[PDB]
Design a protein around this nucleic acid. Sequence first.
RNA 1: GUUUUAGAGCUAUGCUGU
RNA 2: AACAGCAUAGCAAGUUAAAAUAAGGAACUUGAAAAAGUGGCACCGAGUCGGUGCUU
Length: 1062
Amino acid sequence: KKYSIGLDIGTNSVGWAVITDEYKVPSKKFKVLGNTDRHSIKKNLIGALLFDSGETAEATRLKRTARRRYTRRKNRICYLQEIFSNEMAKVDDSFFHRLEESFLVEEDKKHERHPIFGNIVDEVAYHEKYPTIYHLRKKLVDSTDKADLRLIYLALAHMIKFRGHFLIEGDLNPDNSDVDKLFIQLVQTYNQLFEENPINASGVDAKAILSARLSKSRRLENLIAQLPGEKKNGLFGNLIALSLGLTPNFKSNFDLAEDAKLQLSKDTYDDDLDNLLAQIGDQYADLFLAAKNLSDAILLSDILRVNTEITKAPLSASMIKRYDEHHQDLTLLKALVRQQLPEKYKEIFFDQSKNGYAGYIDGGASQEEFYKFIKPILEKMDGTEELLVKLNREDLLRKQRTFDNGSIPHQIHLGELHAILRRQEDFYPFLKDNREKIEKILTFRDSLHEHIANLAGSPAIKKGILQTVKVVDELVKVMGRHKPENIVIEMARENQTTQKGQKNSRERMKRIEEGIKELGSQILKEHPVENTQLQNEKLYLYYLQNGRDMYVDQELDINRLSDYDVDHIVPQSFLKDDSIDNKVLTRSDKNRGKSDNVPSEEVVKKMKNYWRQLLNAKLITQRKFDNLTKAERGGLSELDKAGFIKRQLVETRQITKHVAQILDSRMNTKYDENDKLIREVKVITLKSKLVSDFRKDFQFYKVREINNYHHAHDAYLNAVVGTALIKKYPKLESEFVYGDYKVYDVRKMIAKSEQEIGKATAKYFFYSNIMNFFKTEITLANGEIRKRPLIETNGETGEIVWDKGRDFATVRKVLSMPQVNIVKKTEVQTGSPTVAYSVLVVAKVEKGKSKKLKSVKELLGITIMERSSFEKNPIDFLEAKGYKEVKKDLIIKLPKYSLFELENGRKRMLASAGELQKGNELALPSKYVNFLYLASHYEKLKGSPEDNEQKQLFVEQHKHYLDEIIEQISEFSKRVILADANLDKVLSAYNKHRDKPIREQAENIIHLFTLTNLGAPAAFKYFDTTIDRKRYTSTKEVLDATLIHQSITGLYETRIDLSQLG
RNA sequence: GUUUUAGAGCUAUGCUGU
RNA sequence: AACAGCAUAGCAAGUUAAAAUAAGGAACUUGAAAAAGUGGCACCGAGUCGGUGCUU
C-alpha cells in the first residue's frame, strides 16, 4: 500500500521498520515449517539482526585485487584494435598482421622485419627525430602535416594506458583545482570533524608557501613555521607530512602499541590504511582522504611551473625540457669526469659493482643510494657551482618516469585527445564520426558486491552494507514486489567506551590551562577541579567564563549553582544547537532584551573590552564571538538563515552518500523516452541529532542495556520523521534528498515579518528552526507561547500531514509494543586445537566388557586440521574415531550458535561441544523502562526545572515499582534460566538492602539484569556482593530438545525435533 | 623493481678458416 | 681479400611497449555451478502473541 522502511547501519546491528501513512506498524501472518504442529503463528514488522566479526569467507570475498584492472586494460586495447581493424582493412594492408608478430626472430616472420612502414630507413630515424614520446605527441598537437595512422595508434594507446584516477568528479576548474582552496577544504574538514581545539588560518597564501621549490623537509617545515597551535608531531603535522612523500608515524596520536609507517608512493598503501582504520575507528576516515587530493595538487604544481602555449600539456612541456636537460648534462658530466679527474672514471661509469652512474642507470640502484655515493666526489670537486643544490633538490639526471604518473587527472589527457582529434578531423572520415565514442570509452569507468567492496573503509562497515542490501531485498520481496515511497538512511553513532570520554576531558583541560596561563587569574589556584569534574556543563562553562557574568559586570558566586540558569545566545526558536559554542551562564536570561533576535546592543558597548580579552585568550572561537556581536551588522539575514538550514538538513559524510547512491541505483531503474532517470523512489538522509532531540523533547526515552529493541526503535523513528519532512517541504528536496534535482534560492523561503506575513503567503516559514512543526506550541525567547493548528495540511495540494491527537498515541503504542524480534546471524567460520564446527552423529558404540553395541548420539568436535578428511569419507572417519554404523542421511551439520529449545518455551544457545549459553530475552513494560531510565538519570536530567521536578515526583511516588520489577525478573528467571542458588543469593541480598536510596537501588537492578541478558554467562557485582558464573556443562538435555532454524531476519522459522531422530 | 628480442659501432694489430 | 668467433688500447651513450601472476619444500527444493524458486487476504483484541470472517 503506502509504507516506508527506516535503516540504521552500524558495526553491530541493522534495524528495520515498516510504517503506513497513519504511521502504524502492520501485523501479519506467515507459514510455519518443521515437524511439530505449531501451525499458528503471527509477528510484527519490527526487528533487528546481529552478526559477529572475524576472518571468514565473507570477509575474504570482499578483498583488494589488480588482475581485474589488468584485464580491463587488455579489453580496452582489444577495443582499440576492433575500432582500427575495419578502417585499416579499408586503408592499410598487412598493417595489423605484422604488429602482432613482433616477438619472432628473422627466420619465420614471413614478412619484413621493419614494423613501422617496411624499410630500414625510418626505423632508427624514428626515434632519432622522436627520441622521447613527447616529441611525437607535441608534433601531432602543433603540426598540420600528414602523419602515420600507426603512430597515432601508438600515441593514443600510450595516453589511455596512462590515463589516471577519478577522485574528482566533473570537469576541471578552480573549484576542484589549485592549492589554496584545497588547503581551505582540509582545514575546514578538520575543524568540522572536531568540535574541540581548533585551527584558524586567516588568509594565509598557502600556495606560495607549499609550491615553493624547496627540499622535502624544508617544505614540511615551512608551513609548520606558522599555525602556532599545532606541532609537527600533531595529527595535522602528520597529515601534511604524509601528503608530500615522506614516511611519518601514526603511534603517538592514537596511543597505539605498534609502529605504523605509511607512504603514498609505496604499493602497500590501502592494506595498511584499512588495518589502521579497523584498529582505531571509522569516524576518523575523513581526514586522510582529504590529503590524497592535496598531494595530487602539490605534485601537479611541482611539475607544471611551465605552460608556454594553451593547447599543450604543461606536463608535456616540462617533461620534454627535462629530457633536453638530461641530454645536456649527459654530455657535460661525461666531459668533466673523463677529462678533469681521470682516475675513478671506470669506478663511476663501468664498474657497475658498487652502483656507479652506469650502475644507477642500468642496475637495481636507487636514487638515494646514487646520491649518497656521488656526494663525496661533488663535495671535493672544484667548480661545482649550480650543481650541489640541485643534487639534494632531487633534480639531477631525473628519469622521465617516476612514482608520479598516477597522480594525474584524466581531464588533461581528454583535452589533448580533443585537440588531436580536432587537428585530424577530416583526413580520416571516421574520426569526426566516432570522436564522441572514443572519448566515451577512454573516460568510461560492476556488480553489487564490487560496488560494496569499492568503498574505502574497515570490513565491518562493508559487511554491514552487504547485510543492509540483503535486508532491503528481503523486505521489498515480503510486500509483493511493491516499491516504497520513502526510505530513510541514518548512521548509528558509537557510544563512548569510557576511553574517548576521558580524552575530551583532557582537551578541554588543555583549553582551560592555556587560557589560565595566558590571562593570569588564579582560578585554578583558588579552586582545584579535575577531569572527573569537567563533565559538569555548568561548572565547565563557569571556568570558561572566568567567574563573571557577561551581561552584567559582577563576579559569580561558586556555591549557588542551583539558582543560576543556562541560556542560549541563539534562541532555540531560530536554531537548535546545544554545544558549548552556543551555551553561556548568567544570573537571569532577562537581560537579553525584548526582541527575538541576537541580544541587544546596550550590553556589548560596556564589556567590549571584556570580550576582547576573552577572544584573544583563544578560549572562545571567532564564530562564537561573531554570534556574540551579530547585532552590530544589522542582525539576521537571508544568508544566515540559509546557513542554518543547510547545517541542520545537509550531510557532510561521503560514505552515507555512497550507500544512498548504492540503494538509489539498485532500486530506481526505470527510465523515460528521453535519457532522464525517473526517480520514483526517493532516498532521504538525515543526521542523528534530529531523532535525539525528538526523543528528548517528546519523552520517548530509550535504554540500550535492557534488550536489543533500541535499534529497531530508532529504525521506526527515523522513517517517521523523514516522511513528515518530505511531505511538509517538497521544494527543499534538493537539500537532503539525493539526486540531480532542480536547485532553488533563498528569497522564496524567507518572509519579511513573523506575524504580519506568516500564514498569509505560499512561502513556507519564517523561523529558521526546521523542526518546529513537530511541536504543538512554540516557545519564544521572551516568554510568549504560540499556537499551531490541530491538523497540519499542505497548502499546495490540500492534503494533511500531521494529526496532533492521533500520531502521538500511535507512536506511544509502537514504542510500548512488547514483541520485537532479535536474531543472531549463524555463520560457519573459515580460518590447544580449535573447533571449526561441531557435528551431530548417531552410531553404535561399545558399552561394557563384552563389547556389546548400542546406538547413541553424541556431540563430537571436528578440529581445524580435520574438516577436509571428514568431508572425503566421514564413514571410515567416524569408524576410526570410535563409532560404528553411522547414518549418513541423519548426519546434520551444526555451526556455532545453534538454537535449541525445551519445555515451557525455554531456549538454549550452544557455545562449544561441552558448554551452553542462554537463548531468551526479557520483555518489560514501557512505564517500568521509563522509571528505570529516570531513576538512573535523576542528577543527569539535563532538562528544564519544571520538567525535572515533575520527573522526580514521578520517581518518588512509585516506590513499589521496584518491588514488582524484582518480582518480574524472579518469575522469568524461575521460568527459564534455572539457576536456583543464584536467585537465592540475589533475592536474599535484595531483601537485605531494601531501605537504601532509590538511586543506588536503580543501577544495581540494571546490573542484575545481566542474568537475563542474552549471551554467555558473566559475573557482576551487587551493592557489596559478587556472583560467579554458572557454566552449563551438561550436554545431555539437548539430545531430546528441539532445533529451531532461526532465519536471517526472523521472518521464517523451521523447527526440527531431535527427540524423534534416533 | 624482473626476464629476452630489435636500436648496422669505428681505427690500427694479430689468428683460424670457406 | 669479404665474413664469423677471439686478446687488446683508446673514443661517441641511456626513460617506450606486448607477456607472466601462485605445483610453495538462517532452513528447504531443482540443478556441478553461475543461478532459479518456497511462506494468502480483512476485522477485533494485546504478556513473547490470541480469536473471528474470506480464501489457498
